[PDB]
Amino acid sequence: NLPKARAALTSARTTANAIYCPPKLQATLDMQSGIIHAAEEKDWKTAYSYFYEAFEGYDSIDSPKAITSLKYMLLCKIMLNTPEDVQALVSGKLALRYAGRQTEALKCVAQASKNRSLADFEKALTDYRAELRDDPIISTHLAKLYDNLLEQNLIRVIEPFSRVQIEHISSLIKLSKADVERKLSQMILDKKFHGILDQGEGVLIIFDEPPVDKTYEAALETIQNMSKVVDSLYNKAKKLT
Amino acid sequence: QAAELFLDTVSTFTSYELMDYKTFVTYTVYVSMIALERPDLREKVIKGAEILEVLHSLPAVRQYLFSLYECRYSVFFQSLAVVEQEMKKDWLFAPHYRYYVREMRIHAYSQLLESYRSLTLGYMAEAFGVGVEFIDQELSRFIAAGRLHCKIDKVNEIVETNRPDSKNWQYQETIKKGDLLLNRVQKLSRVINM
Amino acid sequence: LLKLFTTMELMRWSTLVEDYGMELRKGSLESPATDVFGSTEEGEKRWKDLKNRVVEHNIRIMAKYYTRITMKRMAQLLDLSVDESEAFLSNLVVNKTIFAKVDRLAGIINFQRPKDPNNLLNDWSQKLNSLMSLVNKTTHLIAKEEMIHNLQ
């Protein structure tokens, strides 16, 4: 229940400064802000920073609580795939302080973030399935990943040659008409992909001529030129009568 | 200007003159699906904070926004009808509910035809379930009214897009406005002398 | 070895197997054929790479000559199958050494040129090159007129 969790988080906002010292609240409040907002899909890198700020407050607390705490933050590095904070965290003394079993399995999970590599990703997906169960939201984490990795693999095969047949290139992605080809059509709507397909002969042809410096810089000024005359129409009509 | 002045959202909070703010969310979301463009549409709700939690409480409204970005047309005949039910039962929307229907269609048909240069209505019947004679006269009365100019073939099951509207028509507005306007300064130039 | 590199063109690939197939019997020194064609697993990798060298050296000069070609004409020129042509067109295109547009429905394929969006280049190449030679006529034509009139 997300609205109930926000109401529970809202009650923690006024309770943080209510008593004298939290003693630890805002550290957990920022962690709770990195959960509900993570389900709200507000922002990734900032929510990942809340797991980093909470990890700084996790120093000298119950180890069974800190051994499952790295399950959330290191899998968050898997969701983002571009946190840019990788080298900062994992190279520090605080992230490497845990030598235990489960965290060593998370050490290669944090390495799997630097891995990507679909063929490797589909493999470690089964090896890390034990850590997949502790994922708070299993759908949102791996769906955006695999959907982002889709077009990451799509831009690789379409790049070398301009036009591509859609029957052979879809055999690598295992299907054509159901979803994939509709996802490539959505990339045209998002401008990430420039090209057009052919349903009859099954060939995707990429063609682009984006720049036009003659039409755009002209018509915009002519429309502005109308505003120059319309504003002068007040001078014209008033001086005559 | 509607969706522009509705950007205040929770900044006005709830007042005796603002009634239920959740109803104001339904008022700003119905104007946002048209005037706010698809790149800006997903930009406001996703990146938005205070406006995101109020739409999440409504499962029907939130599902429509995610489906609009998902482009699936199977739920559009369902979800939009539920929205149209609210459009019928709300005041001041009685004269305005006739154009709103097809305006979200061309908004969905805009990105639709942009996908493929050659499209078949049999593929449209898939998501429409099943558009055959319905979209025939539908798209016919669209192009006739100047909404999303396109060439859709009959019994050959072919749609043609084009339309390259950034070349010829963009030069026409020059002389179009340059006719009646310049004619006004003509008579105005005939005032001198007398 | 150098004849294939200079002026390129084509050759019968079996004739290359005739010259480099006798180098195993050549010698005196058999060491060049040992480290290359003597290893079974290493040589076959270099044999298929030898196929990649002869096909890529042709694609480079063909990129200069295209314009356009038909897919069926490429197989008889490369002396291999149409399926092997798509394989040799697949590994070379990801190396982005030659830009190409591959249309397999009609068989027409072409190496570059990218749709020819330019206009002024056709006006600049035509006018400058040709007309400067047309105006250079009068320069040395009256000069050749002086050369011939100083004698006859």
Q: In whole angstroms, what is the distance from residue C104 CA to residue A4 CA?
A: 58
* Tokens encoding C104: 């397999």
CB A194 within 8 A of CB A208: yes
Sheet of C100-102, strand order: C69-70, C108-111, C100-102
DSSP letters for B104-162: HHHHHHHHHHTT-SEE-HHHHHHHHSS-SSHHHHHHHHHHHTTSS--EEETTTTEEE--
- Three-class SS state of A165: strand
* Tokens encoding B89: 């039962």
Residue A100 Cα to chain centre, angstroms? 30
Q: In whole angstroms, what is the distance from residue B130 CA to residue B126 CA?
A: 6
Size of interface A-B (CB pairs under 8 A): 68
Q: Which helix (H) or strand (E) holds C90?
A: helix C82-94
**Cβ contacts of C100 on chain A, cutoff 8 Å:** 161-162
- Report CB contact under 8 Å: C101, A207: no
- Residue ranges of E strands in chain A: 164-165, 203-204
**Cβ contacts of A3 on chain B, cutoff 8 Å:** 53, 56-57
CB A55 within 8 A of CB A69: yes
Q: To one decimal place, what's the resolution in Å?
A: 8.0
- Location of structure tokens 């290669």: A108
CB B2 within 8 A of CB B100: no
Nearest residue of C to residue A200, measured between CA atoms: C105
Q: How far is CA A217 from CA A42, A212, B170, in A?
A: 37, 9, 11
- Report CB contact under 8 Å: B118, A42: no
Q: Which distant-in-sequence residues (6+ apart) come within 8 Å of C127 by Cβ?
A: none
Q: In whole angstroms, what is the distance from residue C150 CA to residue C140 CA?
A: 15
Q: Which of A40, A38, A41, A105 is nearest to A76 (CA)?
A: A38
**Cβ contacts of C101 on chain A, cutoff 8 Å:** 161-163
Residue A66 Cα to chain centre, angstroms? 26
The reply to whether B44 touches chain A by the CB within 8 Å rule is no
How was it solved?
Answer: cryo-EM
